[PDB]
Symmetry: D2
Subunit: 105 residues, 4 copies
Amino acid sequence: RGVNKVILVGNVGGDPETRYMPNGNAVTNITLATSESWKDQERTEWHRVVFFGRLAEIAGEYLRKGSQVYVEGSLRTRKWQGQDGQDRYTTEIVVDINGNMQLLG
Amino acid sequence: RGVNKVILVGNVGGDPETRYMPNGNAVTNITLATSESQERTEWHRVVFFGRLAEIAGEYLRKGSQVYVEGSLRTRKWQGQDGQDRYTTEIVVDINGNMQLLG
Amino acid sequence: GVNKVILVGNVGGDPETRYMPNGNAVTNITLATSESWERTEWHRVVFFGRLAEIAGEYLRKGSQVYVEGSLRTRKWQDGQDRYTTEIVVDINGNMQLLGGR
Amino acid sequence: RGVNKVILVGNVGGDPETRYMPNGNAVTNITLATSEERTEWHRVVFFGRLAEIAGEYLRKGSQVYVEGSLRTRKWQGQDGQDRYTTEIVVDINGNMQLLG
């Protein structure tokens, strides 16, 4: 009914973590930094990006710490009970068949 | 260094909450629902600043369909028990955009 | 690279739908977007495939729509070269009629 | 009223063309190739501070991210016939990021 779109150009924070489901489909997790400048100063936003499927395979193979990457996906907030029993929330950028990723540079 | 862009089309969840900061500028909070076809619904925490904050408080109501262009910002806060909490908000200020649709 | 156009605007007239030899549908509209600082930009939108049938069937003059696509500058011919930059909305794009409960 | 937004990532085709004008406004012109191998050529025009930055930092072959708005301008050719040129305008509402 609506539109849920995120566009990021940033730098991969760590070694991408790739995983596989029983069926063989790939899931790759990264953090992606984007930052702003300032004077009279730097604010960095750390985004949790999850790729699915083909893009997960490309991401897991070619991305490295410091990779500059374009990502188009959608926002998803996952709900989970912490070990102390209270609700927590995690907002991720989901990059699947409806999204896009381009390796830059 | 880099691009941080969110584009939403969705429906306001409730009447906007407008407040003001010591320096007088306006801050308006809303929740925005976006849904995809079975049906799944994402709830977004949207925060308007400055001029778009006044407009949003002025014209948005619990039903309104709205276009929002902003940036993601995960802010950290502390709960009742001194435990860390994080909330990722879509921040809409001079570099963003909001359009009431209809 | 990346080639992405995002429009919210009003359908300028009733869609034109045609069919290509292989039978696939192509629907042309014009989409008005404007800003006040007064100026209206008239976008040439071309839908392909499933969205073309949907667009021709359900969009009308004055419909408010969201469109996501890519820029394509098309060459045609007077004998002199002409060019039209179109927003191409096929399987990689998105179209949503706005409004609703 | 509506929304008019274009997001491109591509390579600058030629060396940017920058000119300054009386009011302090600068204008930079480039062509930008995106390919998906079919290549699409985009006319991109920067205004203001981004035109200054584009002229300083972009060169032929630079990879760049560009966010702007579509603008079609009308002109009469030297044969007297109407022609149209669609450009991506990158001004204060837009954005540019040199990549690589």
